[PDB]
Amino acid sequence: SELIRVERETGLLTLRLDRQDKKNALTRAMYSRMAEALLEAQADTAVRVVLITGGDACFTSGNDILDFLEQPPSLRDSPVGRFMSALLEFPKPVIAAVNGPAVGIGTTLLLHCDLVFVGRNARLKMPFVNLGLTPEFGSSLILPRMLGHAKAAELLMLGQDFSGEQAAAWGLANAALEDGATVLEHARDAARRFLHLAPSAVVESKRLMKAPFIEELRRVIAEEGDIFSTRLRSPEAIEALSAFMHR
Numbered sequence: 591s592e593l594i595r596v597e598r599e600t601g602l603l604t605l606r607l608d609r610q611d612k613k614n615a616l617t618r619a620m621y622s623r624m625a626e627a628l629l630e631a632q633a634d635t636a637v638r639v640v641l642i643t644g645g646d647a648c649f650t651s652g653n654d655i656l657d658f659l660e661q662p663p664s665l666r667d668s669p670v671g672r673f674m675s676a677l678l679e680f681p682k683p684v685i686a687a688v689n690g691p692a693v694g695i696g697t698t699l700l701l702h703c704d705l706v707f708v709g710r711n712a713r714l715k716m717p718f719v720n721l722g723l724t725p726e727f728g729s730s731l732i733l734p735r736m737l738g739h740a741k742a743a744e745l746l747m748l749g750q751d752f753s754g755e756q757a758a759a760w761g762l763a764n765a766a767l768e769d770g771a772t773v774l775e776h777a778r779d780a781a782r783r784f785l786h787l788a789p790s791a792v793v794e795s796k797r798l799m800k801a802p803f804i805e806e807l808r809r810v811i812a813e814e815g816d817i818f819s820t821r822l823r824s825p826e827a828i829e830a831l832s833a834f835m836h837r
Contacts, residue, residue, distance in 0.1 A: 594623040601638040601785045602778070603631045606645060613651035613691060614644045618661075621669035628676040638789060639781040640680070642703070643687040646770040649712070652694030658721070658831050662822040665815040670695070674727055674811065677702045678804075681793055683784050687777035688712050688754065689769060698727035700762060704796060707777045708754030709769030714762075715751035721834055722827030724817050731810040736761065 595606040605624055607614040624642075631637040644650055653670070665671060677684065677699060686700050688708040697714045700706045708714075718724055725733075725746050733742035737760060744750045758766035767773050784792060821827045 591619075591623050593617060593620045594627070596623075596627050598637075601636070602641060602781045603627070603634075603637045603639070604641040604643065606643055607650055608645070610645070610648060612654070614648050615651045615654040616670075616695065617654050617657060618669040621673040625669065625672040625676040628673075628680055632676075632680060632682065637682070639683045639685065639784045641685045641687060641774075641777055641781055642699075643774055643777070644689065646689055646774065648690040649686075649688040649692040650694075650696040651691050652696050652717070655721075655831060655835050658822055659828070659835070663819040665819055666812065671815065674699075678728075678807065678811070681797065683781070683792060683796065685777050685781055687774040688714075688763070689773055693717060695727060697762075698725075698729045700757075701727065701729060701732045705777070705780050706757075706763040707773050707780070708757050708763040708766050709773050710753065710755040710758075710766040711769050712754035712757070712766075713751055714754065714757055715749060716745055717749040718818075719747060720749045720830065722824070722830030723821050724814065726811075726814050726818050728807045728811050728814070730814055731807060 593609045595608050597604040597606060605627055607620065609615060609617070609620070628640065631640050666675070683704045684702070685705045686703040686707065688700065688706065689712055690709070692700070692712055692714045694716060697716050716725070716729060718726065729746065733745060745752070754763060754766040757763040765776070767776055
C-alpha cells in the first residue's frame with residue numbers, strides 16, 4: 591500500500607496521502623485504505639487521535655477524474671462511500687492539516703473533521719458544478735446552515751475558490767498558518783493537546799455535538815449521492831468531465 595501512508599506515534603495515527611505525481615488525486619484504492627485505517631483506528635484503544643494530511647505542499651486535487659469517467663457509479667456501497675461513512679461516524683478526534691490544493695472532497699471532508707488547520711495560501715474549492723456535478727458529503731446541508739445560503743451558493747453553485755486564510759475567517763478552518771511544515775507541526779501539537787484530556791469526555795462531547803445532526807446528515811449524504819451518481823452517467827456531466835480533461 592503506497593498511496594496512503596499510515597504512520598503511528600504515541601496515541602496518534604496519521605493518514606498521509608502520498609500520490610504527489612498526481613497532486614494526491616484520490617483513487618478507489620486510496621479511499622478503501624483510508625476507510626480501512628479509520629475502522630482499525632476506531633477499534634484500537636492505543637489510537638486516541640487521527641491526523642489526515644497530504645504533506646507540506648498538497649492536500650488533494652480531488653477525486654481522480656478518470657475514476658469519474660470509468661467505472662463511475664456507486665452510492666453507499668463503494669470505496670468512496672465507505673470512506674465517507676467511516677469518517678462521518680468516526681468517534682475519536684480527527685484533525686486535518688491542509689497545504690496547497692484541497693479540491694472537491696478535499697474540501698468537503700474537512701466538514702467532518704474536529705479540527706482543521708490550513709496554510710494561509712492553501713487553495714480550496716468545490717468544483718462540482720464546473721464538472722456538471724452536484725454537492726457531496728453533506729455539503730449541501732452543512733454549508734448553507736453554517737454560512738447562509740448566499741455565501742454557500744458562491745461556493746457550491748459557482749465553484750468559487752478560496753484561500754486558507756478565507757477558510758479560517760469563515761470558520762471552515764480553525765486557523766490559517768504559515769504554509770508548509772508549520773501546518774502539520776501545529777496539527778500534531780493540537781493532537782498532543784487532546785492526549786492530556788479525559789478520553790471519554792472528549793469522545794462523548796464529540797458524540798453530543800453530532801447527535802442532533804447525524805440522522806439528517808446521513809439522509810442528505812444518501813440523497814446527494816443518488817443525484818451525483820445519476821449525473822455522472824448523464825451526457826451533460828460526461829462532456830464537462832471530458833472537457834476538463836484534455837482542456
